[PDB]
Structures are given as C-alpha cells and as structure tokens.
Design a protein around this ligand. Sequence first.
Ligand SMILES: O[C@@H]1[C@@H](O)[C@H](O[C@@H]2CO[C@@H](O[C@@H]3CO[C@@H](O[C@@H]4CO[C@@H](O[C@@H]5CO[C@@H](O)[C@H](O)[C@H]5O)[C@H](O)[C@H]4O)[C@H](O)[C@H]3O)[C@H](O)[C@H]2O)OC[C@H]1O
Ligand SMILES: [Ca+2]
Ligand SMILES: [Cl-]
Length: 302
Amino acid sequence: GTCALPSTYRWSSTGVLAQPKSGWVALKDFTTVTHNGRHLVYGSTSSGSSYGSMVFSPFTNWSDMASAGQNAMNQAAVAPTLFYFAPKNIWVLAYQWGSWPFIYRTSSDPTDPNGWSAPQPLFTGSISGSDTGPIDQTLIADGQNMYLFFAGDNGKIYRASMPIGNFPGNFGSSYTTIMSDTKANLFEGVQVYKVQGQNQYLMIVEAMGANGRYFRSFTASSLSGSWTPQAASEGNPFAGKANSGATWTNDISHGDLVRDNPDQTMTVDPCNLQFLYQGKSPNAGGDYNSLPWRPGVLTLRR
Ligand SMILES: O[C@@H]1[C@@H](O)[C@H](O[C@@H]2CO[C@@H](O[C@@H]3CO[C@@H](O[C@@H]4CO[C@@H](O[C@@H]5CO[C@@H](O)[C@H](O)[C@H]5O)[C@H](O)[C@H]4O)[C@H](O)[C@H]3O)[C@H](O)[C@H]2O)OC[C@H]1O
Ligand SMILES: [Ca+2]
Ligand SMILES: [Cl-]
C-alpha cells in the first residue's frame, strides 16, 4: 500500500482559492497541516508596504477556503513554518524577521493567531553574498536530530542541526552550506519532507524560470546526506508552468505540500500528494512587494 515519488510529475490545479481580506493585496508563503480533520493554514500577508501574517479559520474542503475567516496575527510571523512537536506536546510556529534572523513561538492551540508565546531565537547566523540574509526557513526532524534548512536568495541552500532533545531551542550562528548553484536555480522557498513508505527525503526549492517561478526537487536517503537532483529543470520541474495544469497562473511559488500528519517529521504521503502554492495573474506587474499572490492547490495525477 506504499507509493513511490514519480520521476516525472503531472498535476491538476484548482483555480484561485481565496481573495485577501480588505487591507491586503496578497496571501503568501503558506504552511499547512490537518488539525482535527480540517485544513489549518498560516501564511504571510502583504499590504504592499509591509509583510505580516495570518491564519485562516479551519475549513474541511479546499473549495471552502474562499469563505474561511482570515485572522491577522498581531505580531508578524513572515514566511511561517507550522508543526506539532510531539516530544513536548507543543505546537511551533517558526518564521523570519524580528529580534533574530529566524524566530519561533509555541502554542497549545495553533488555531489562535494571537495565542502564541513570546518570540524565541531560532537562528542568529549570517550569510555572505545575499541581499536578503537568511530567508524561508523550514524545520524537519527524523528520529534523532532536528534540522533547519534555509535559503539566501543567492543560489545557496543552508542546513543546521541539533539533537531533538535540545529542541525547542536556538540553532545559534553555525550552519553548513549544502548546495550552491546560480541565484536563479536555487533561489528561495525551500521545503523538506519525509516520503512516507520510502527510505527517502524530498527537498523542493523555488527557482526563477524563463516562464515564471517553479520548483526543482531533490532526494536524499538521510537528512544529513547529499541531495540528488530529481525533477530539477524548468522543462521537467517538480511543479511549474510546464506541469501544474493551472490556467490562472504561470508561477508556482512559495507554499507547502499538504501534511496530513502535523508532526515535526514533515511526512507526506506519495499516494495522495498535494501542493498548496502561491500563484499570480500572468498580467500582474509592478513592484515585487505589491504582487497579488493567491493560494492554489495542485493534486498529483497518478
Ligand atoms: O522587526 C524588524 C524586522 O521586521 C525587519 O525585517 C526586515 C524587513 O525587510 C526585509 O527586506 C526584504 C527582504 O526580502 C525581500 O523579498 C525578496 C525580494 O526579491 C524577490 O526576488 C526578486 C523578484 O523579482 C526579480 O526580478 C528579482 O531579480 C528578484 O531579486 C524575492 O522573491 C523576495 O523574497 C523583500 O523585498 C525585502 O523587503 C529585511 O530583509 C528584514 O531584515 O528588520 C528589523 C527588525 O527590527
Ligand atoms: Ca516556508
Ligand atoms: Cl548540519
């Protein structure tokens, strides 16, 4: 009853799933789990001037995302990562920008945008040759170690680790540079998952293609191991204009595979793979920060 990841990906897509509430021009950078049988989605927001964050009211079907309440967080958690940390029975929301490069907060109730604890440092390091600094963290643990992965808008992917028993905690300043390519090839939006039923981990990285944003995939047998390109070109992407089946967007950008198990292992089921992504009208132009990004969901066609 186990499935493998395909070598070539083909998706079908929803249309735009929701419009930003009054005061925002974009919904972005989604992170999602299933919580009590419902979709639980955090994201960045943009007013065009600054980024903030929000959580949607829980909803059972993606087709009902359009009517879900949009609940602003009073303290911004830009480009968030949401998961349940089972060893301490606590929810974790990690994010960028504030007192430290990466930050996290904890909660016993992840549906509440303002029930999160005081911010704690997640990462305090700095990288070279980046206009942004550390960007788009994710967190993932195996049975032994908690890993931090992140990007730098500069062609590099970075990794840090600690024994799981030391988490929640600060990774500190140290990191490993694990991948290095052109800025376009390894840009941002990095995510890492355990492939359920396989001795395999899946990494996806957002790249800048000729036709728009797309994702390149890599696999590893271990979270500390080397990453092998999988579907890693614009013509044969993990997800992009070439294979999304989306008509409303030519961009497949920063989001999260749908995680049915909300825990720190970031486990995905290759038999029912879905991708909650951000896209935008091909006609939308202007300053990056003002782009009208919207949620969509891809469903893998097997
Ligand atoms: O609490 C306070 C903090 O909030 C504060 O955080 C700072 C907030 O501003 C941050 O600057 C942003 C860095 O990230 C950028 O997003 C990039 C922009 O570039 C995009 O890529 C471009 C797309 O178009 C192409 O043509 C072009 O070639 C690409 O480069 C990319 O997709 C985005 O992710 C934002 O635009 C910046 O506003 C800053 O880093 C934070 O430090 O700090 C103080 C603290 O007290
Ligand atoms: Ca993310
Ligand atoms: Cl490491």
